[PDB]
Amino acid sequence: SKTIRSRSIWDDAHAMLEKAKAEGISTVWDRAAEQTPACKFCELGTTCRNCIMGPCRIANRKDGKMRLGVCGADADVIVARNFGRFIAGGAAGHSDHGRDLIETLEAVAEGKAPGYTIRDVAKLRRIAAELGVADAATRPAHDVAADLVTICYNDFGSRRNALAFLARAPQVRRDLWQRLGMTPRGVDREIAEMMHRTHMGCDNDHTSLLVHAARTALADGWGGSMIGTELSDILFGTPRPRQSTVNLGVLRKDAVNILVHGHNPVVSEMILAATREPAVRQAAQDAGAADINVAGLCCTGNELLMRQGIPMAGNHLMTELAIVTGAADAIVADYQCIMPSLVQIAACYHTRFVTTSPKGRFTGATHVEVHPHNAQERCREIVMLAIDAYTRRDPARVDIPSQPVSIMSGFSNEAILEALGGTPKPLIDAVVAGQIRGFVGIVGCNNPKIRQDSANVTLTRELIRRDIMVLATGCVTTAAGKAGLLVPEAASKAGEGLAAVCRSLGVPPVLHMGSCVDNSRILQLCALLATTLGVDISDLPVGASSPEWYSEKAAAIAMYAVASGIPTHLGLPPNILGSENVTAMALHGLQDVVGAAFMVEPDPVKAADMLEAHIVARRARLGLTS
Amino acid sequence: SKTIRSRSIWDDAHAMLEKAKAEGISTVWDRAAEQTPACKFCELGTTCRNCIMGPCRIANRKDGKMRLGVCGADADVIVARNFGRFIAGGAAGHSDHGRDLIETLEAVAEGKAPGYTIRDVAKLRRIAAELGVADAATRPAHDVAADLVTICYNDFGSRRNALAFLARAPQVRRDLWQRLGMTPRGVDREIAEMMHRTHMGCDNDHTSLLVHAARTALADGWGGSMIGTELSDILFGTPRPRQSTVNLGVLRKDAVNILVHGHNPVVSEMILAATREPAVRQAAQDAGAADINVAGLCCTGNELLMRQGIPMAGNHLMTELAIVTGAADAIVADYQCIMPSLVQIAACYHTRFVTTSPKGRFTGATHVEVHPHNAQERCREIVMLAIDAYTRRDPARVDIPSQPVSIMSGFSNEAILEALGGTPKPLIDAVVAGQIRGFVGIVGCNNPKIRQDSANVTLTRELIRRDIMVLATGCVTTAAGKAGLLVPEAASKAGEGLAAVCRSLGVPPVLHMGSCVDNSRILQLCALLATTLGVDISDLPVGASSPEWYSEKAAAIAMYAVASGIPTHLGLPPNILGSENVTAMALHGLQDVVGAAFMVEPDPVKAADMLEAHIVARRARLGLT
Ligand code: SF4
Ligand code: SF4
Ligand code: FES
Ligand SMILES: [Cl-]
Numbered sequence A: 001s002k003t004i005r006s007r008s009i010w011d012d013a014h015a016m017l018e019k020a021k022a023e024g025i026s027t028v029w030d031r032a033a034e035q036t037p038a039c040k041f042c043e044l045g046t047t048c049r050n051c052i053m054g055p056c057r058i059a060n061r062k063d064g065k066m067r068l069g070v071c072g073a074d075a076d077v078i079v080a081r082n083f084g085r086f087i088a089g090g091a092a093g094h095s096d097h098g099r100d101l102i103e104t105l106e107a108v109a110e111g112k113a114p115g116y117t118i119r120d121v122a123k124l125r126r127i128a129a130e131l132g133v134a135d136a137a138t139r140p141a142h143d144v145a146a147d148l149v150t151i152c153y154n155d156f157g158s159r160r161n162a163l164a165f166l167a168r169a170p171q172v173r174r175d176l177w178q179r180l181g182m183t184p185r186g187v188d189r190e191i192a193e194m195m196h197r198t199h200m201g202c203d204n205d206h207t208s209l210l211v212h213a214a215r216t217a218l219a220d221g222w223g224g225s226m227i228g229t230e231l232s233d234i235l236f237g238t239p240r241p242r243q244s245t246v247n248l249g250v251l252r253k254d255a256v257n258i259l260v261h262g263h264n265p266v267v268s269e270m271i272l273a274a275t276r277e278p279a280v281r282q283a284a285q286d287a288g289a290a291d292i293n294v295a296g297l298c299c300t301g302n303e304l305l306m307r308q309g310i311p312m313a314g315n316h317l318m319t320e321l322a323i324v325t326g327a328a329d330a331i332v333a334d335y336q337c338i339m340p341s342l343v344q345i346a347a348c349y350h351t352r353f354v355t356t357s358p359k360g361r362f363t364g365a366t367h368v369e370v371h372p373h374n375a376q377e378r379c380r381e382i383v384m385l386a387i388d389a390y391t392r393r394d395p396a397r398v399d400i401p402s403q404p405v406s407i408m409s410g411f412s413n414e415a416i417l418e419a420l421g422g423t424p425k426p427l428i429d430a431v432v433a434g435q436i437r438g439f440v441g442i443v444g445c446n447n448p449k450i451r452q453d454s455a456n457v458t459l460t461r462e463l464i465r466r467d468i469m470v471l472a473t474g475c476v477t478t479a480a481g482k483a484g485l486l487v488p489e490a491a492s493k494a495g496e497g498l499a500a501v502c503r504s505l506g507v508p509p510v511l512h513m514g515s516c517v518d519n520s521r522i523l524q525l526c527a528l529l530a531t532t533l534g535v536d537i538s539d540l541p542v543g544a545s546s547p548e549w550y551s552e553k554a555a556a557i558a559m560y561a562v563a564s565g566i567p568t569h570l571g572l573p574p575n576i577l578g579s580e581n582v583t584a585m586a587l588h589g590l591q592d593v594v595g596a597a598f599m600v601e602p603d604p605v606k607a608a609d610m611l612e613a614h615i616v617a618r619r620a621r622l623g624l625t626s
Numbered sequence B: 001s002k003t004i005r006s007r008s009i010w011d012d013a014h015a016m017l018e019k020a021k022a023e024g025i026s027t028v029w030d031r032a033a034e035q036t037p038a039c040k041f042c043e044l045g046t047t048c049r050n051c052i053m054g055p056c057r058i059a060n061r062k063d064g065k066m067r068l069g070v071c072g073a074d075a076d077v078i079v080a081r082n083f084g085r086f087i088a089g090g091a092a093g094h095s096d097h098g099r100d101l102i103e104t105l106e107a108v109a110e111g112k113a114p115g116y117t118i119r120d121v122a123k124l125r126r127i128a129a130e131l132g133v134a135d136a137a138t139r140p141a142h143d144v145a146a147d148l149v150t151i152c153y154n155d156f157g158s159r160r161n162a163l164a165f166l167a168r169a170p171q172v173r174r175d176l177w178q179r180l181g182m183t184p185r186g187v188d189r190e191i192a193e194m195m196h197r198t199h200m201g202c203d204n205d206h207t208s209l210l211v212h213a214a215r216t217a218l219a220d221g222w223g224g225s226m227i228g229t230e231l232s233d234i235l236f237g238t239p240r241p242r243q244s245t246v247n248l249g250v251l252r253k254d255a256v257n258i259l260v261h262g263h264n265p266v267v268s269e270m271i272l273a274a275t276r277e278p279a280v281r282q283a284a285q286d287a288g289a290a291d292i293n294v295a296g297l298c299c300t301g302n303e304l305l306m307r308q309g310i311p312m313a314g315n316h317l318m319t320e321l322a323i324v325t326g327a328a329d330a331i332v333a334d335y336q337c338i339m340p341s342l343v344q345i346a347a348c349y350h351t352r353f354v355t356t357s358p359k360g361r362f363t364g365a366t367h368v369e370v371h372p373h374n375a376q377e378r379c380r381e382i383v384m385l386a387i388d389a390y391t392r393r394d395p396a397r398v399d400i401p402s403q404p405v406s407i408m409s410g411f412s413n414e415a416i417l418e419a420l421g422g423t424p425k426p427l428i429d430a431v432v433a434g435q436i437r438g439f440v441g442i443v444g445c446n447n448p449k450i451r452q453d454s455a456n457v458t459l460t461r462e463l464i465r466r467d468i469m470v471l472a473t474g475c476v477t478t479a480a481g482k483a484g485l486l487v488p489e490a491a492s493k494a495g496e497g498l499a500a501v502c503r504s505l506g507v508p509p510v511l512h513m514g515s516c517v518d519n520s521r522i523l524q525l526c527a528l529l530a531t532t533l534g535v536d537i538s539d540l541p542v543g544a545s546s547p548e549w550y551s552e553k554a555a556a557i558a559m560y561a562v563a564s565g566i567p568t569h570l571g572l573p574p575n576i577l578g579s580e581n582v583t584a585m586a587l588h589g590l591q592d593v594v595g596a597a598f599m600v601e602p603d604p605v606k607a608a609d610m611l612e613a614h615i616v617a618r619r620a621r622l623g624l625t
């Protein structure tokens, strides 16, 4: 069908879209159509609901009516406040994510987290020493962990001048942020200050609002997300390269299928552990299943892929379709990007929809709350619920539509450096020689406005063909994986220089660097290259892109990339076009503030042209001649 | 004109609206008319812009379309999320306010804040001891201040199970919050968690969202605001009863008039100090002025009234009209509730519009940024700018319209207990005897939807006539003051029981308890009475009301009052009526959960009836006539 083929590039999506239609199940694409046309003011950003003197709408009329809100605020202020709160929502998601990792490490240090441990003591000691813990190399591991917990929690307080991990950024970048008033000080503090600035009659200057939006996003990339990544590696292991598989075919008709969905590995790692206990496996065998099969969705799926090689069922717009296979016996959710439509779709089948976080409550879900002290017991109960649901699966409604395809995952900065021999020198040498022109992180989401994964995959293919290595995270991981680009043999799809480097190292031309919080790994890598070369991040031949973004988190990631010196492309515009001044600041003005800017471009080939053009210019800034 | 008369009850407002009309100057009321009718979905709360799969609107269509957002969220979730973020914005305003006081007190302790001091050393030692500082009674004052700073900052961290001042709440109330998951833990943490919960695909249960809204607001009332109030008393003095005046007539043709606008006394106190320096006074006299006349607007005006008796020129909807007098030589702003239209109106005159906070930037303003290390120097500089502007005032456009009305301010809890002889016993005995039937805090704003101060004044008058003492904060202060309700002789306006107690104590029937952060004083008073009587705040004959509210801050105050057990009336509905379930929770469901609920009622006489009815029911459960 042409309408169904227009919604996604993938056969597995098409098959489940057909099954959903036949069964009368409404999907995210159906609801997107209902919501089109959108409200013009909402789309432009020229609407405000921040007090009950309003709500207000801003028009552009020759007679001057409705030019200002009731309080006097103009389109520039209203649009900038709205965008600031949008950014703050994304930073807040990453803040709570990182905070939960601190709380879990603390519980381990206290001896109050059955089934959790310090999996990577070497990294604990290295990170602790980096951040100033005394005698981190030799003191008892739990004492070192307790001191690292204190440092991390202090970044969630209000007494710092600069976040702890900010020391990774080059001195020139730190000095610029300091002069601009952009230095992130406290992970929660910047969010609170954003919410204050956007209250009526506080910050009424669009430039000031956007500068604080950058500071808020920086407190995510260098704070909430970076703490989340580094502590996740400490608690659950530092990723190393491993093979796995992707697509809806990772579900198995003969197994109990448990889909983990959401974000935090504190839950999904303990779900996986529960499925390996002998009595739990025996219960599944008694129910007639051959195995218990955990498969991943979205970022928590990325986490289990990076650390445990667990196959990934799908990304954002696959989530409803994964239930439509009829073979999902449970979805185990925590928080973020979990569409509430999944509760209703699960109810069309036998699938248990289980929530685990006090923050991720869904009306009608089965709530089994997880905390470090009870996770081992509670995750066992959740797996038993999934086995019970399996006994009620209707065989006649099962359609697992595809066979999975192979992928390589696990490219932490530690794994990349190990592949290079311990230092970044061979990578720098390849860039200087012109074999690799530059690097682009392709990050972020799906969005029903764009045929699913069409731009994600086309941009990836375009960049590697141009000898630009791609670093993939988030829901782009699934797109690149299903396209066959996450394997070493995909070097045949790269240009001659990138293909040669990739074959020499035995790595794909697209490196999976993890979940959305793991975009902090991209910041760390950029800072390392810049510090090694004695330059700013804004001097490096790098870029970032989210061709199909949707979320507040993706906007926060794009903003912290830009504010750190990385040109960042977005496939779709934020709701800001109602202010020409805010739009011009985002697309042009920021170049002269932070050394990078946003780009908005829905044609992925043109986006590749624009990203390549920045890389060409940065190579010239570095004096390269190759 | 007839339209002008319909916009306010006050002569000074009418005179300035007539003047603005004659001069072609538009006001908040003109822009409110342009924005009516409002977008129906925005007004109902059934619109969401939290991701670019949207924006979404929830409609009731015969074809069943648009019942859900693109992510699947229904009207209950969308409305509850919108209300949660609204509350979070209010809590955040009070969070940063309190944080600035911590930073200033720390700068004093470090010796890096010229012109700032510990003005109330005894209160510093008392608060420090209450919160656990060792030897707070005997150590050098600045050492004790440094330890109090650390405790307050820990409440802005992520390691507490409960905020430090929560210990004031009665045990039964703390036990209830703990079982509901409402205990506030960190002032910034609850705001951040609210923004996380309201991201797409996080909290999708309207009950959970409203429970966290209560927790976020409680982290304001017992955290951001309470720290702000108590540290302000430490740095600037504990308010005591004193005389002052209110209305546009506090401006003086023969003086350099400096309006202080916004919220934080760390700036307005230092502006006031600068105007008192001899050389600055001489510069004003050299310029032709008789003196320098500081006058307050909004909450920073309330702060200067409470601690220094500085006259208050007006509340929220008077702010544009104060510039229209033509006599404002400077307006000195920090943050919150400062309408950006004031920059444009100031530009119609000689008035300088000066911003002082890195958070309160206004395109076109003169920015003179204030911090503890430079406040004394910068505030002197700002006053000199006002004196210079005075030399260019156009006397043809000066019209200061009224005679100022006398008020009494300064009713901190410390002052109230002192008037009672040191304990709450005479106040409890007046309640038991039925002379004072109950207490209502009338708090919050103006709103162009309601004839300015009409409901604030009517509700205050109705309550005192029913022997219900009124505690006034925020922009209500100006309304009660202009109505002649803030003086001891106003006992003649109250019922016989309240009048007799007021005359016995020498106090007005309406007690000015301060700025909007000073609603924390009302929480402290309720907690003291509840603990004294061995009951919950939800057992006390109390209520709260914002008849003319507008701001996110006012909604956060209302929510923390409800969550603390205080029945709370609002004159206008929040943007929640698109969800019957969220509305029913706010108006009814919370009653069984936290012991109090919101009420929405635009008729202030009916609002008086409803607040009195709650007071009567609670008196009965205490065993009182
Ligand atoms: S803050 Fe200003 S623009 Fe926004 S709703 Fe209130 S009056 Fe309208
Ligand atoms: S969060 Fe859901 S309801 Fe809100 S804009 Fe996004 S898709 Fe629409
Ligand atoms: S829904 Fe109200 S302006 Fe868009
Ligand atoms: Cl620091």
Ligand SMILES: [Fe+3]
Residues within 6 Å of the ligand: A299, A337, A444, A445, A474, A475, A516, A553
């Ligand atoms: Fe993501």
Ligand SMILES: [Fe+3]
Residues within 6 Å of the ligand: B299, B337, B444, B445, B474, B475, B516, B553
């Ligand atoms: Fe106020």
Ligand SMILES: [Mg+2]
Residues within 6 Å of the ligand: A103, A106, A107
């Ligand atoms: Mg713990």
Ligand SMILES: [Mg+2]
Residues within 6 Å of the ligand: B103, B106, B107
């Ligand atoms: Mg300081």
Ligand SMILES: [Mg+2]
Residues within 6 Å of the ligand: A358, B180, B181
């Ligand atoms: Mg709970």
